């Protein structure tokens, strides 16, 4: 189609047809506190996430939907997850340990030593020796309880949304490819290479979504409070498979000793791949990049 514009740089619209797959997340921290034959995703009047990604498939009747799950799930909590794929055709359960992410990783200890050599070839007056001591202080702690830590396997062992966020990023680097590694049947209309829709659980379809045109073909959430907005990841929209902004936001992960899967994997690579800099307008950065559809709506958990 058309073309967006940031700054004095300018963009093709790119398509995300009506079969780019849907997908939601529900990492599960405590799945005992359902029951032990019960759908382990929260359906709470407060958290009515499972109610959401149903009512989604309902309206999105022949387009993929992925659920990203992961979790200590008890044999009859897997069973009813499959009986979910059964009442809803589109409805495709990932179990996030039945994907190989590590292609996408890197030793702790590579990343360490690469700054300690680069925060070391720096004279005195520009070191960081706050942060040259914190860095060889991570690095041994490394080589003296797990020499081989990496990116995946210490991410993997964090409690909170830096877990969830971090895996986030990895499968929409995948993208569709995910569907077809984790070896679900019937996408028919999934391409390989092709792109992906995450979702946060409290954003509500209302109606079809058709074919989507984002700059570069990637757009994400922007969140207003108060008077205040920022990019965010409770939407990531890519399509293709290992789109050069997320897969940048994963180099300024595999370059930096403590990168965040959200202000680095996804906003980092964002601002770094359209050039938004220390120089441009962050607010006008937010307008062109933002994800905009009048039949989602945004961010229920916030009060609704
Ligand atoms: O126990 C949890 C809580 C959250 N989430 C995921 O994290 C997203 C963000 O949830 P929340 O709205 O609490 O985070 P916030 O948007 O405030 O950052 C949800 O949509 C889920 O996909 C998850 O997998 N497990």
Same mark, same amino acid.
């Given at each position: 189609s058309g073309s967006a514009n940031f700054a004095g740089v300018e963009?093709?619209?790119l398509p995300l047809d009506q079969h780019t797959p849907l997908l939601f997340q529900w990492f599960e921290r405590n799945p005992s506190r359902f029951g032990e034959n019960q759908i382990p995703i929260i359906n709470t009047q407060q958290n009515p996430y499972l109610n959401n990604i149903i009512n989604a498939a309902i309206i999105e009747k022949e387009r993929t939907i992925g =659920?990203? =799950?992961?979790?200590?799930?008890?044999?009859g909590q897997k069973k009813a997850l499959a009986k979910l794929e059964k009442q809803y055709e589109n409805i495709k359960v990932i179990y996030n340990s039945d994907?190989?992410?590590?292609?996408?990783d890197k030793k702790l200890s590579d990343i360490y030593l690469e700054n300690i050599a680069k925060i070391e070839a720096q004279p005195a007056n520009v070191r960081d020796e706050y942060l040259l001591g914190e860095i060889k202080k991570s690095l041994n702690e490394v080589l003296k309880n797990n020499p081989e830590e990496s990116l995946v396997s210490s991410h993997d062992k964090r409690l909170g949304h830096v877990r969830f966020?971090?895996?986030?990023?990895?499968?929409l680097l995948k993208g569709s490819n995910?569907?077809? !590694?984790?070896?679900?049947?019937? /996408?028919?209309?999934?391409?390989?290479?092709?792109?992906? #829709?995450?979702?946060?659980a409290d954003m509500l379809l209302t109606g079809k979504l058709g074919t989507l045109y984002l700059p570069d073909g990637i757009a994400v959430h922007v969140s207003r409070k108060g008077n205040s907005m920022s990019? !965010?990841?409770? #939407? #990531?929209? =890519?399509?293709?498979?290992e789109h050069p902004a997320l897969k940048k936001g994963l180099e300024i992960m595999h370059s930096k000793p403590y990168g965040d899967p959200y202000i680095?994997? =996804? /906003?980092?690579?964002?601002?770094?791949?359209?050039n938004c800099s220390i120089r441009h307008n962050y607010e006008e950065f937010c307008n062109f990049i933002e994800f905009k559809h009048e039949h989602i709506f945004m961010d229920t958990s916030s009060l609704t």
């Amino acid at each position: 189609s058309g073309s967006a514009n940031f700054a004095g740089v300018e963009y093709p619209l790119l398509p995300l047809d009506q079969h780019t797959p849907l997908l939601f997340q529900w990492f599960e921290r405590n799945p005992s506190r359902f029951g032990e034959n019960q759908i382990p995703i929260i359906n709470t009047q407060q958290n009515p996430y499972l109610n959401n990604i149903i009512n989604a498939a309902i309206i999105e009747k022949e387009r993929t939907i992925g =659920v990203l =799950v992961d979790g200590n799930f008890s044999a009859g909590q897997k069973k009813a997850l499959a009986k979910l794929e059964k009442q809803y055709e589109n409805i495709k359960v990932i179990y996030n340990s039945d994907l190989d992410y590590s292609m996408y990783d890197k030793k702790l200890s590579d990343i360490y030593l690469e700054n300690i050599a680069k925060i070391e070839a720096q004279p005195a007056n520009v070191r960081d020796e706050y942060l040259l001591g914190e860095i060889k202080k991570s690095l041994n702690e490394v080589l003296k309880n797990n020499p081989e830590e990496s990116l995946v396997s210490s991410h993997d062992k964090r409690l909170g949304h830096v877990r969830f966020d971090f895996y986030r990023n990895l499968f929409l680097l995948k993208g569709s490819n995910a569907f077809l !590694e984790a070896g679900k049947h019937g /996408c028919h209309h999934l391409q390989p290479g092709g792109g992906c #829709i995450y979702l946060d659980a409290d954003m509500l379809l209302t109606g079809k979504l058709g074919t989507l045109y984002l700059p570069d073909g990637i757009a994400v959430h922007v969140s207003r409070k108060g008077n205040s907005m920022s990019l !965010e990841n409770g #939407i #990531i929209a =890519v399509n293709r498979s290992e789109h050069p902004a997320l897969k940048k936001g994963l180099e300024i992960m595999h370059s930096k000793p403590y990168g965040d899967p959200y202000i680095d994997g =996804v /906003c980092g690579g964002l601002r770094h791949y359209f050039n938004c800099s220390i120089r441009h307008n962050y607010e006008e950065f937010c307008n062109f990049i933002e994800f905009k559809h009048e039949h989602i709506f945004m961010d229920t958990s916030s009060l609704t």
